[PDB]
Amino acid sequence: KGTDSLKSSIEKYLKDKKAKVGVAVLGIEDNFKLNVNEKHHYPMQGTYKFHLALAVLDKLDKENISIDKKLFVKKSELLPNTWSPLRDKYPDGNVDLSISEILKATVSRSDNNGCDILFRFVGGTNKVHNFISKLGVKNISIKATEEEMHKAWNVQYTNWTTPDATVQLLKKFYKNEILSKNSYDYLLNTMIETTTGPKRLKGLLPDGTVVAHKTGSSDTNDKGITAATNDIGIITLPNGKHFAIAVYVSDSSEKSDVNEKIIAEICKSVWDYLVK
């Protein structure tokens, strides 16, 4: 078989890498499947903004609320010292922003204050955890907001996932089994139209490959450990078909260009195998 050689090629690549790397791949319209180091809990960081976006849009679908509905955002919610184009654009806060604009910032640009604004909108982290569980995807833990994760170093490990869970959720999303058509179209576009992680899943793919993804990243502690360098999404093959893929480079002693290269190389190997 070819799948075992792909898995063994990946594991040989990972042998000399000082990181715990989890991989999962799921064909969208066929039943291709690949796991590496699947039984392990990987810190999600910003990739859970995808999960949160599902929860927000689902609420908008079920309650018949327009994505253009405006929410008043208090100055006290545009926290400083955190990645937030929203705060940079409205430094004084106390502004009415459409859910559309907050969602765009959160998903395409990974806004941390946008993230927490939307968590408040859907009722908290536990609400998102329940919504994901009620879809029949287990092994995703969603316990901490961005503001909580920016405190103790350990908090980021309470937002964890297996690689399997991610691609199952990506495929449910991509096959439009979660959202209304308009919500699905919006979220998909914001995931394609992101400028983040150019050196990760897309790093080594041919130019013009469409990739809908969400990145996650962490700090590096003073023992040189980068907790999380992630990229998850749906890639379009040359023949027009798709696959969902998630790569978690966790607890890494490698430099950041290596951590991104690992994502890029694993994705490239999976791409090469499925093209062939």
Q: What is the CATH number of the domain that holds 24?
A: 3.40.710.10
Nearby residues of 194 by Cβ (< 8 Å), 6 or more positions away = 107, 108, 109, 213, 214, 215
What is the sign of the dihedral through the CA atoms of 108, 135, 247 and 7? negative
H or E segment at 160? strand 160-161
**10 burial class (0-12, 13-18, 19+ CB within 10 angstroms)?**
buried
Could you list the residue range(s) of the whole structural domain that residue 140 is in?
A: 1-276
CA distance 53 to 172: 14
Experimental method: X-ray
Best CA proximity match to 123, nearest among 136, 101, 142, 98: 142
CA distance 150 to 111: 13
Q: What is the CA radius of gyration of the chain?
A: 18
Cα dihedral 68→214→163→10 (10° resolution): 160
DSSP category for residue 47: G
Total domain count, the chain: 1
Backbone φ, ψ for residue 28 (5° rounding): -85, -50
Q: Which amino acid is at 182?
A: N
18 bridge partner residues: none
Best CA proximity match to 127, nearest among 148, 143, 111, 112: 143
Furthest CA-CA distance within the chain: 60
- C-alpha 227 chain-centroid distance: 15
Q: Which amino acid is at 80?
A: P
CB atoms within 10 A of CB 180: 14
- Token code pair at residue 11: 């594991």
- Token code pair at residue 190: 């914001």
CA distance 269 to 275: 10
Best CA proximity match to 217, nearest among 149, 122, 129: 149
